[PDB]
Amino acid sequence: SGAIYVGNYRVVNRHLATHNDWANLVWEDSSRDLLVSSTTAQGCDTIARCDCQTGVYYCSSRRKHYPVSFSKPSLIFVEASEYYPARYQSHLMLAVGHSEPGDCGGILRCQHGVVGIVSTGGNGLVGFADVRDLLWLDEE
Ligand SMILES: CSc1cccc(CN2C[C@H](C(N)=O)CCC2=O)c1
Numbered sequence: 001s002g003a004i005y006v007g008n009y010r011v012v013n014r015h016l017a018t019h020n021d022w023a024n025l026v027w028e029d030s031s032r033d034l035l036v037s038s039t040t041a042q043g044c045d046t047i048a049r050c051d052c053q054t055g056v057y058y059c060s061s062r063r064k065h066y067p068v069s070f071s072k073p074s075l076i077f078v079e080a081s082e083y084y085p086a087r088y089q090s091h092l093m094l095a096v097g098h099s100e101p102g103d104c105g106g107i108l109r110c111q112h113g114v115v116g117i118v119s120t121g122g123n124g125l126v127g128f129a130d131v132r133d134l135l136w137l138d139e140e
């Protein structure tokens, strides 16, 4: 579990969105496993606007924050899971590291702010959905 709170927006994994997130939907993309909903209170997170390939992510299944090198956002084949059939997931970055399904929502951050959230994993890899291209998260 986990979310990014920036301005009046809440960014969550699309598969973990609640009834309130869908009722207050701003934007969602099944191919990215992302959903953004509106909030009444202002958030304090800052989204990174950079091309960083090193950062730290939180892994709840180990209660640990791991420093990682990650690939640039790409279209990657992702095996079938409890929430999606086998498909290509877009804007996805991979790192070598631990992840389990319940780790989705864990933040990946670099020196510039939030880069993305855990979305995939398996075989000693962890994948993160990028949010740095969603420039509109910074305004209105
Ligand atoms: C096998 S370890 C692992 C870690 C994180 C996630 C998964 C599987 N998965 C991937 C889904 C997607 N984004 O396509 C989102 C929901 C989900 O449970 C496995």
Ligand SMILES: [Zn+2]
Binding pocket: 048, 049, 050, 051, 052, 110, 111, 112, 113
């Ligand atoms: Zn950065």
